[PDB]
Design an enzyme around this catalytic site. Structure first.
Site, PDB file in Angstrom:
ATOM      1  N   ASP A  55      -0.387  11.068  19.372  1.00 54.11           N
ATOM      2  CA  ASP A  55       0.164  11.391  18.058  1.00 54.11           C
ATOM      3  C   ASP A  55      -0.968  11.895  17.165  1.00 54.11           C
ATOM      4  OD1 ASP A  55       2.316  11.721  16.262  1.00 54.11           O
ATOM      5  OD2 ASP A  55       2.165   9.724  15.439  1.00 54.11           O
TER       6      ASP A  55
ATOM      7  N   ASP B 119       5.461  -1.629   5.010  1.00 56.02           N
ATOM      8  CA  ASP B 119       5.112  -2.828   5.769  1.00 56.02           C
ATOM      9  C   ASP B 119       3.577  -3.013   5.965  1.00 56.02           C
ATOM     10  OD1 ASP B 119       5.181  -0.520   7.640  1.00 56.02           O
ATOM     11  OD2 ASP B 119       4.602  -2.079   9.125  1.00 56.02           O
ATOM     12  N   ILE B 120       2.757  -2.197   5.295  1.00 58.79           N
ATOM     13  CA  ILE B 120       1.330  -2.481   5.236  1.00 58.79           C
ATOM     14  C   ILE B 120       0.927  -2.883   3.801  1.00 58.79           C
ATOM     15  CG2 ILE B 120       0.770   0.014   4.939  1.00 58.79           C
ATOM     16  CD1 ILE B 120      -1.860  -0.607   6.493  1.00 58.79           C
TER      17      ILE B 120
ATOM     18  N   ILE C 257       0.785  -1.239   0.000  1.00 58.28           N
ATOM     19  CA  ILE C 257       0.000   0.000   0.000  1.00 58.28           C
ATOM     20  C   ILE C 257       0.834   1.316   0.000  1.00 58.28           C
ATOM     21  CG2 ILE C 257      -1.772   1.314   1.251  1.00 58.28           C
ATOM     22  CD1 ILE C 257      -3.095  -1.130   2.073  1.00 58.28           C
ATOM     23  N   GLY C 258       1.878   1.463   0.825  1.00 52.85           N
ATOM     24  CA  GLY C 258       2.351   0.477   1.783  1.00 52.85           C
ATOM     25  C   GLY C 258       3.741   0.733   2.336  1.00 52.85           C
TER      26      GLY C 258
HETATM   27  N1  LIG Z   1      -6.169   0.219   7.612  1.00 56.82           N
HETATM   28  C1  LIG Z   1      -5.617   0.888   6.571  1.00 56.82           C
HETATM   29  N2  LIG Z   1      -6.145   0.796   5.330  1.00 56.82           N
HETATM   30  C2  LIG Z   1      -5.606   1.429   4.271  1.00 56.82           C
HETATM   31  N3  LIG Z   1      -4.514   2.208   4.354  1.00 56.82           N
HETATM   32  C3  LIG Z   1      -3.896   2.397   5.543  1.00 56.82           C
HETATM   33  C4  LIG Z   1      -4.402   1.730   6.746  1.00 56.82           C
HETATM   34  N4  LIG Z   1      -3.584   2.091   7.764  1.00 56.82           N
HETATM   35  C5  LIG Z   1      -2.631   2.919   7.240  1.00 56.82           C
HETATM   36  N5  LIG Z   1      -2.833   3.091   5.917  1.00 56.82           N
HETATM   37  C6  LIG Z   1      -2.051   3.875   4.945  1.00 56.82           C
HETATM   38  O1  LIG Z   1      -0.926   3.102   4.526  1.00 56.82           O
HETATM   39  C7  LIG Z   1       0.124   4.000   4.135  1.00 56.82           C
HETATM   40  C8  LIG Z   1       1.478   3.561   4.683  1.00 56.82           C
HETATM   41  O2  LIG Z   1       1.440   3.761   6.092  1.00 56.82           O
HETATM   42  P1  LIG Z   1       2.790   3.966   6.938  1.00 56.82           P
HETATM   43  O3  LIG Z   1       3.940   3.880   5.963  1.00 56.82           O
HETATM   44  O4  LIG Z   1       2.762   3.064   8.148  1.00 56.82           O
HETATM   45  O5  LIG Z   1       2.613   5.491   7.436  1.00 56.82           O
HETATM   46  P2  LIG Z   1       3.865   6.500   7.515  1.00 56.82           P
HETATM   47  O6  LIG Z   1       4.408   6.451   6.103  1.00 56.82           O
HETATM   48  O7  LIG Z   1       3.257   7.823   7.916  1.00 56.82           O
HETATM   49  O8  LIG Z   1       4.771   5.905   8.570  1.00 56.82           O
HETATM   50  C9  LIG Z   1      -0.262   5.381   4.656  1.00 56.82           C
HETATM   51  O9  LIG Z   1      -0.596   6.162   3.508  1.00 56.82           O
HETATM   52  C10 LIG Z   1      -1.506   5.177   5.515  1.00 56.82           C
HETATM   53  O10 LIG Z   1      -2.460   6.236   5.360  1.00 56.82           O
END
Ligand SMILES: Nc1ncnc2c1ncn2[C@@H]1O[C@H](COP(=O)(O)OP(=O)(O)O)[C@@H](O)[C@H]1O
Length: 350
Positions: free
Chosen positions: A121, A15-16, A13-14
């Site tokens: 946060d 470690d997600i 998406i995205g």
């Molecule tokens: N449950 C979810 N469903 C879809 N997208 C999500 C979810 N949780 C977080 N995200 C998105 O996934 C993307 C990657 O998140 P992350 O890399 O952890 O945030 P950051 O880059 O601020 O540390 C971000 O754009 C966040 O908005």
């Protein structure tokens, strides 16, 4: 790439990651963490999500635990963050959108605090709209920095402490967070206040600072937060925004916020501005108008049509304003909105 029994990991998406329930075909999201992490956080975050489960706009966690050499968390798939949408709208929101956002976010924070946690946060990146038909609901994410502020049973508040180092994002951090004071409920609400002002005015006056050390940047931010008047900070906003800020800065460390009092600031204001809480957000109307058109300059044109077609929804802070405008003064913008401008005005009616 199977997680739990029934979930499959898809694209990043995205470690997600995007994910899919293999039995039902429902799209979910899947967060992975290496078990070789020096600073594990995902199990803690899963457990907080689980403890908060059932609150409105809290993402529902479907599964969490160990899978292969990863901790994994399976959760509702959500939509864009408020910071993403803010960018989509070219970094200013209308009063109506900010009000509608405020009303939902205040409830989210109230819910979280009622479960004995503080978020710590609070910032635009950590509020996401749902996907599809749930696009109308503000959700809260990223509980890795959250903390229990009172005993679950006795409601005994955690002790007053000083000398804490700043966590996490200096731009929206409360003044007391800068000063090293143990965070509590007031600090979540103060950060939400900075967001609302940021959304309305386009920026906060302590953005873009540079310094020689990390601490020096934080302190230059703190000095602006401390030494700027609420009147300067909230210039061009209806009085409710400065009253919200004044309220948060005056809360005592262990004090229970009057969340209804704060929601009423925005609800009473919405009535005076003649806004229905209809979940028709700036992006929703901009996106819709562009769809009809296509059948930075291009955006300005789409915006002009949107504000013509939705003249009573789109009122903006004037940053040259030195004062707090009355609702009647703000509603004068409906007339201006309808006064702007053939084949395109025709298509807009259609
Ligand atoms: N449950 C979810 N469903 C879809 N997208 C999500 C979810 N949780 C977080 N995200 C998105 O996934 C993307 C990657 O998140 P992350 O890399 O952890 O945030 P950051 O880059 O601020 O540390 C971000 O754009 C966040 O908005």
């Amino acid at each position: 790439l199977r997680v739990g029994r029934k979930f499959r990991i898809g694209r990043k998406i995205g470690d997600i990651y995007h994910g899919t329930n293999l039995i039902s075909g429902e799209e979910v999201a899947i967060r992975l963490e290496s078990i070789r992490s020096r600073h594990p956080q995902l199990d803690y975050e899963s457990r907080v999500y689980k403890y908060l489960s059932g609150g409105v706009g809290i993402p529902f966690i479907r599964w969490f635990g160990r899978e292969g050499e990863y901790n994994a968390m399976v959760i509702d798939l959500l939509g864009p963050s408020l910071e993403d949408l803010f960018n989509y709208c070219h970094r200013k929101f209308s009063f109506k959108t900010v009000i509608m956002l405020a009303l939902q976010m205040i409830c989210r924070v109230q819910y979280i605090h009622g479960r004995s946690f503080i978020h710590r946060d609070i910032k635009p990146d950590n509020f996401l709209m749902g996907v599809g038909r749930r696009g109308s609901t503000v959700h809260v994410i990223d509980f890795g920095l959250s903390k229990k502020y009172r005993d679950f049973n006795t409601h005994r508040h955690i002790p007053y402490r000083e000398n804490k180092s700043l966590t996490g994002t200096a731009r929206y951090a409360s003044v007391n967070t800068h000063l090293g004071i143990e965070q509590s409920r007031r600090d979540d609400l103060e950060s939400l206040g900075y967001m609302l002002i940021y959304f309305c005015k386009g920026s906060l006056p302590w953005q873009g600072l540079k310094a020689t050390t990390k601490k020096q940047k934080y302190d230059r931010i703190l000095e602006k937060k401390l030494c700027i008047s609420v009147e300067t900070l909230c210039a061009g906003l209806p009085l409710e925004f400065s009253e919200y800020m004044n309220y948060c800065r005056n809360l005592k460390f262990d004090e229970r916020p009057d969340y209804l009092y704060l929601a009423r600031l925005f609800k009473d204001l919405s009535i005076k501005l003649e806004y229905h809480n209809d979940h028709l957000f700036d992006w929703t109307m901009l996106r819709y108008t562009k769809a009809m058109v296509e059948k930075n300059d291009s955006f300005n044109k789409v915006k002009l049509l949107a504000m013509k077609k939705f003249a009573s929804h789109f009122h903006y802070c004037k940053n040259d304003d030195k004062h707090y405008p009355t609702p009647e003064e703000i509603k004068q913008q409906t007339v201006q909105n309808n006064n702007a401008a053939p084949e395109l005005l025709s298509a807009i009616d259609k």
